[model samples]
Target: RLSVPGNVIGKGGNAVVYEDAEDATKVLKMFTTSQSNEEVTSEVRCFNQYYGAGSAEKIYGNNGDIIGIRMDKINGESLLNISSLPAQAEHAIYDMFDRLEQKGILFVDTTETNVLYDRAKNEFNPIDISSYNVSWSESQIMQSYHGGKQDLISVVLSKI
Candidate 1:
């Protein structure tokens, strides 16, 4: 296991996020229990899959039990906070989601909260990569229970 220091930057339902002591550009997310191990694995895989594609964040490393992942720390505002999105930004978001779907990854949590708008680069960056469903059945169920990719896209793009 890796040592992630004491700086707590964020926290979610099943994990605690810490700013990497040695790298300000990265953050370490530690899952609460072994139950979340699979989610951790999924997240790492998604990140790696899109490493240089700019569709997902970059994964630096992880721990043995699959409880933790070190990834790029995005500096941006949640899309939910933005009143409107520029045309270019909207296109970028749409293309990103399309590419992710083409890769067979389901954007399970494709809500405004998980989509961050970076003013510096004038683009959108997705967070919570772990929530992406890689399992076809699970993804189909999730999409049906919640909404399909296009539906979610409409919800996000409604801002424009």
Candidate 2:
């Protein structure tokens, strides 16, 4: 009786992403690991911490044991798909890091595959918000923030 809604849109090492059948705007990320319950909960918490800041995907709901999340479907290409990036995209990426920092969030996974580029909107969005650490200490957060910033810059440079 464990069934996930919608069709499979993507799959990663840990989860399978599904696009909602009735709602095109939403998608479900269902984890395959036994640790999915904890992972889903953590992602939900991190999404709440972001508070709809637009830096990350908008999470709507999740199931406890089934371990899936319903979030806004991002209509964009992952940074890994593009050979080059615009200068504006570079700035947008940096700005997104700053915005996440303002919410006391520091990202640990700085992979290009985690970021999406919406050409029409000219914006960058993080698909995996759960990998971030929510820190309260300004000094420590700032330190990690700079580190993530430099790492993200290298990612951008590698693409360009």
Candidate 3:
């Protein structure tokens, strides 16, 4: 399989993402050094066990060297880049989160960097959910904490 191009996507504190060569319209995320092999394995196991296809994004494959996560290349700016979103857009995002919660998935990282806006689909989809957990209710408060700085008040209020 072909590796992704350099600097195609942004980098996190521990991981970096790039556009996949097989499909330029998709992305692949790999850990730098902060993540251990066991952690990656656990994430993959959780993904396959709980959400399956409901996880939103897909995991390409993994080896001892790296773990590849595949996601749709949402063509739009990050939510943090925009000052604010229209009520409809905000509602759509909340709806998506609600759907996730209904399926027992909690987006552990609700930061702007993890959320991509797709103007074409008029929807907000989460990208880096490997840190997410199957026990959504247990971590609901923590997830809300990450969203606060991004002005995602609706998520906080909606939590039960």
Candidate 3 residue lDDT tens string, 27-144? 6676665566656665555454344643324343445454555655556767666665655676667775776566566556666676666666766766554445444564775656
Which predicted model would earn the best TM-score? 2
Error of 1 at 57 (Å): 12
The predicted structure with the larger lDDT, 1 or 3, is 1
lDDT of 2 by residue, 36-116 (tens): 455666666666566464322323334424456677786689888888877777777877777777776676666788878
Give Cα-based local distance difference scores for all models.
0.65, 0.68, 0.58
lDDT of 1 by residue, 1-160 (tens): 4455558976777778888888777787776645554555577677656545432232333433455667777778877668776667767777767766666666666767776788778766667764434435765666563565566567556776
Question: In angstroms, how far off is 47's CA in candidate 3?
Answer: 6.4
- Ordered from best to worst TM-score, the candidate numbers read 2, 1, 3
Which of the two candidates, 1 or 3, achieves a greater TM-score against the reference? 1
lDDT of 1: 0.65
* TM per prediction: 0.72, 0.76, 0.65
Displacement of the residue 143 alpha carbon in candidate 1, Å: 5.2
| lDDT measured at residue 118 in model 3 versus the true structure, 0 to 100 | 69
